[PDB]
Amino acid sequence: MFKVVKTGKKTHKKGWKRIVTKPTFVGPDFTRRPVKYERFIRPMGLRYKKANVTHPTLNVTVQLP
Amino acid sequence: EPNRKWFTNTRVISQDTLQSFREAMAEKQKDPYTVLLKSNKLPMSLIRHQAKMTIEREP
Amino acid sequence: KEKQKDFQKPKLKVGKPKQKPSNFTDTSFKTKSIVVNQQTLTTEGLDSAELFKQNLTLAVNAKSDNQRRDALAYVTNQLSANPANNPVGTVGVLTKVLPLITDGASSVRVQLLKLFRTLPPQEVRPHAEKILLYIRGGMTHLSNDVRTDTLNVLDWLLEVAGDEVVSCPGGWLKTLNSFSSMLGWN
RNA sequence: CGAUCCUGAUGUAUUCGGAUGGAUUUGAGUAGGAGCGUUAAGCCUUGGACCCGAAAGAUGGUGAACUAUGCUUGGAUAGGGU
RNA sequence: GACUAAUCGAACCAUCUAGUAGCUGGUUACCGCCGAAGUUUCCGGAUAGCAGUGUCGACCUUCAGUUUUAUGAGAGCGAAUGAUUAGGGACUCGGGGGCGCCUUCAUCCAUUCUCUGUAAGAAGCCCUUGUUACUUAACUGAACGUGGGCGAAUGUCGACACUAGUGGGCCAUUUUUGGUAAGCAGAACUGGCGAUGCGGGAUGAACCGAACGCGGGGUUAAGGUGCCGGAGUGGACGCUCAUCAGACACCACAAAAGGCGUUAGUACAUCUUGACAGCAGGACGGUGGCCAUGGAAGUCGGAAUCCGCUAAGGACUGUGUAACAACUCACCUGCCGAAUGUACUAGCCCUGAAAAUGGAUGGCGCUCAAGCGU
RNA sequence: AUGGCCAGAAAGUGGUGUUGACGCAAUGUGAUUUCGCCCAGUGCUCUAUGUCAAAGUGAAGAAAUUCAACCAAGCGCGGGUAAACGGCGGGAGUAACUAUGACUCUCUUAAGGUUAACGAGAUUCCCACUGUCCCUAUCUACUAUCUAGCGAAACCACAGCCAAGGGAACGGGCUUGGCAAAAUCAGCGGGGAAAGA
RNA sequence: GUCCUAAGGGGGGCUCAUGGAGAACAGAAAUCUCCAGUAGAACAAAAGGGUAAAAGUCCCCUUGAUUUUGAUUUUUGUGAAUACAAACCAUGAAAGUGUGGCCCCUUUAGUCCCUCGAAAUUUGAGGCUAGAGGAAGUUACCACAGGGAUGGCUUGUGGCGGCCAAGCGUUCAUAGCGACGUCGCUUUGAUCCUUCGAUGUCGGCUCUUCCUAUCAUACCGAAGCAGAAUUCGGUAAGCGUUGGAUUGUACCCACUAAUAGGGAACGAGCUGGGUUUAGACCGUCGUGAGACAGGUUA
RNA sequence: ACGUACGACCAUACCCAGUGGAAAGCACGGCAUCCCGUCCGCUCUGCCCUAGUUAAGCCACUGAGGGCCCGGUUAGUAGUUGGGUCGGGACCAGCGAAUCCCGGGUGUUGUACGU
């Protein structure tokens, strides 16, 4: 789920940040936390807002938020 | 685990309430100096073929 | 109590209104208006009375010595050009600019003296009590330059309205007490 | 037999004494002694303890001939431009 | 945090001092006899198990990782839930609005939907006989003694003392539980290795055979017998020709995969009333069927697709025309002469995806094999 | 100055100090020009109840002792201070133990019409200039080379040709092949070796 | 702070949940009657086990919900449970049943408990017995002792859901997998007003060789390929595959026949970034030493 | 053999329908004084064994009844234990079921007293 993001300038880095490697839905009206205080990084390229949802009885697929 | 609440409607709204909400929210977008309070708790999801016909009639 | 079910059953509480259903949608919202607190840059559409009042406010409330001096100079220039161009009036102008006697800015004090000298004498005359009280305060004030400029103001007041100063209540003995206290002749 | 609990006999410094009986565990106990000294070996403990190896800590002394600063007394540094 | 005698984030000298280290490195003759182990259980450790030396006791009892016989056991969810309420009311101060009166929402209620143990004897069996404070209406029973009489196969120790090392390792078969796109991750028993040499797998921790004093003779296991290499270019019956076959495969590529490669079978069908292939001819009429198209006559399109003459011929299989024409196919007849056609199945073979120094059934090489099956 | 800031084990001890606020001592900022508010918190500082040591006082007891008041400074309470560290709004309505918050309403502001000189500081560009390059060539001296004399060191299990395999993706020794001929000199940096590694 | 953490024993009588059919108001639901009713009720486990003349319910008496001592199981002492042994009882006609509920510090007491060691007493203390209660960071200034530094993988064609279907299975069940396909979600040649996160690092010079997965040259097959220029594909690595711009941080330009892609590194040659010893500054964080979301210089 | 009392296995015995029952034994029955218990002599308890009746209990027989029980098959099949330098499941040595179906049944028996 999470990979370790190393930060710092020394050879010995700090590894408290965790990046989510799977797709996420960040929610409505989402603004990213300050970088000093965000531990869980959800990258913008992995965010989805719609899904291809199939109705089982109607047998139709529509893109829903 | 199986549960009955997976197969129920989670958010419902009526015709008049939806229409009034849309009209009021559109009037709110008319003013650029008026912004909502607690917009994260508001139902903002409700607010937000000629070529095909010609090809169908003549392949 | 540490169990975390997928769905939490709401609990009925007696003596309290029933909770709204889980599928209920609330469309009520509150809006707040954003306003930018910045004046017009050109300041040309306002009437001359509005410029007079705004410059008087700047003279009495500005935190810059040069700004206060320029505002008092603008008011003095309009009063010298036309005494009729006083929408506030002599009483209001005096009431606003009399606390500026004690001001530490010597240039502001000199421009205040010029404003006093260009005020109309017949309108200065009935209000000799308040002006003399401000003279007494700013004249026993500790700063020597403030004392000297306040003595200049008292010289102007004696030149313009001498009888009102020497005949108003407290105009004689209190002024003599302040003079003797500043001179060490007690 | 000793420790623990219950009863309390003859007697009496009438408030001391603890017999007679019981009931449990307990103790490397008794129940026809087995130990003491010494020799040799294995093992354990303490000592530096199979040998070599730290950054260290402490006690008492020696250095300003290098160099850092200060005081005292001395020495030295063409020819042009502005 | 620079300098303080090549020494500075606390100089140099001697001493305490042989400071401490669980960490690193090393730890000295020979032969002989035994000889190991990794959750077994408890809270980083104890402990079971496995070992060696001395003994001692009748080294007495016999027992046994075996067979046979007889007989038994075999935490959570919840119609206590999740919804629906448009139409009906009660509504009234529930809230709120307008003028005590009406209201507008809203309040709810009325409605409804969703069910593995034991036994296989001499210590055993039977008879007689006592003892009792137990028991029975009762020497009526219960134990324990007195006296007497008389058992499946196969193979052949116990208790101490002291001292260890190892006690949550690796691999493999089988079984069981979870999963993954595929890998895989767990437990249980057994075997092996760490501790181990030998023969064969060309070679090698885990494979096969077999475990080891020093020698001689004989015979084999696993594996081999064209040469390297000891032993057969051994014998019988077949299969295969690969433009890097195959000779150690099972896994992946990878599929119900593609082959006008070659064998052996299975099912169905045709056949002297002439099968398959060919050659010589016919392949017609209503009719240029209906609609459409500038034109469309079987053959640019859409929908139907019948009848006659038949030996047989589709309102047509392609070539072709602007449209026709013409040719041809399906089908039939004449010549011929005896076995074929379709689809599967099982073998061997080809392909079924490959990089980058020059190389590998171990090497030469092998083609009625020195390849494959018996 | 019977002082501030420091030294010293102590001292009839010492530095500032042969000194006296235009001085001494501690800091921050760092030429010149230009450039608000808040004492909320934390510091620093000024002024009767609470907290309240030892000594002293009272009671009880036969005493050990126990219990009581009293109880300095500090802390707490109350003020000041932001060229202290810090921080960046205010007021009213509602509400009324304490602290909080929430909720409306309303003002919401310090700053508008000297960057020189100097520099082994860091960066971009232009002209000139050129072997930096197209694209390399040639010359000189000293070496390297050979000779006479003199003469070490690092390093060193043993040695040095490869290809494929050698389960622990290591091979220079093992297996299978290629092959393979004394003894040498100058270069070379692939490999081995080589970095107070 | 209030409330709940459960009544056992003996004897006797009777059946429960529910269904059908009936009785003024009375109906879906009040009480009464019959029949059916293997527990579908109740017993303090909401779908475990066990109970029907009871282990359920009601009635009558009762507190075996009592002392004492061993043994056994769960396994030194416990605690719980199980058969008892002794006493005292309860109930019933009696057999019987009943010993519960179906399964390390602080402090207190001791008459006749013992010591304070020269003797005694009184306070106090100790002992024994029996109870009650309950020690933070930083080091980019550094140092020491050690230990380290998936692979006969991969390539050219998506997922989810639904149909169709050769086939595989399947005839006492007629279910299930399924190639080939197909169907839905992922601007009338537009817009240029939607660039969506370095933890992992690459380049360049020189020089050599190899692979083909061929850009060009050689040859060949097909396409309205008239010619010219091509496009698609095949055999082929013999021979070539360039010069530059841009670091506020990989694409453009030109020449050319063409400016093809890789391996031998990425499972101790030289030189610029990732990249980072010690000096210094700014930003964020921390009371701080310092650390870092970071940026710059040597 | 048939009854009665106490019973052992506890459906081959149970549940639903009909048909019959010599002898005796059962049972239904008749009466509420006493013993006793009820809203009710329904049950229980007391007294009668005379009358009536096999109507019901009970016993026996019947049912292509439901259920239950017992055999064949299923099947030397599924499954399972060891072996191979066996293939890409089959043999070797062995152990070894239950369904589905095809059928049958519809209680044995001890003691004591009687018919």
UniProtKB/Swiss-Prot annotation, chain C:
Localization of this protein: Nucleus
Region (Disordered): 1-26
Coiled coil feature spans: none
GO cellular component: nucleus; rixosome complex
Top-level taxon in the UniProt lineage: Eukaryota
Nucleus listed as a keyword: yes
Keywords: Nucleus, Ribosome biogenesis, rRNA processing
Biased composition (Basic residues): 10-19
Functional summary from the UniProt entry: Component of the RIX1 complex required for processing of ITS2 sequences from 35S pre-rRNA.
Subunit-structure text: Component of the RIX1 complex, composed of IPI1, RIX1/IPI2 and IPI3 in a 1:2:2 stoichiometry. The complex interacts (via RIX1) with MDN1 (via its hexameric AAA ATPase ring) and the pre-60S ribosome particles.
Family according to the record: Belongs to the IPI1/TEX10 family.
Entry protein name: Pre-rRNA-processing protein IPI1
Organism the protein comes from: Chaetomium thermophilum (strain DSM 1495 / CBS 144.50 / IMI 039719) (Thermochaetoides thermophila)
Taxonomic lineage from the root: Eukaryota, Fungi, Dikarya, Ascomycota, Pezizomycotina
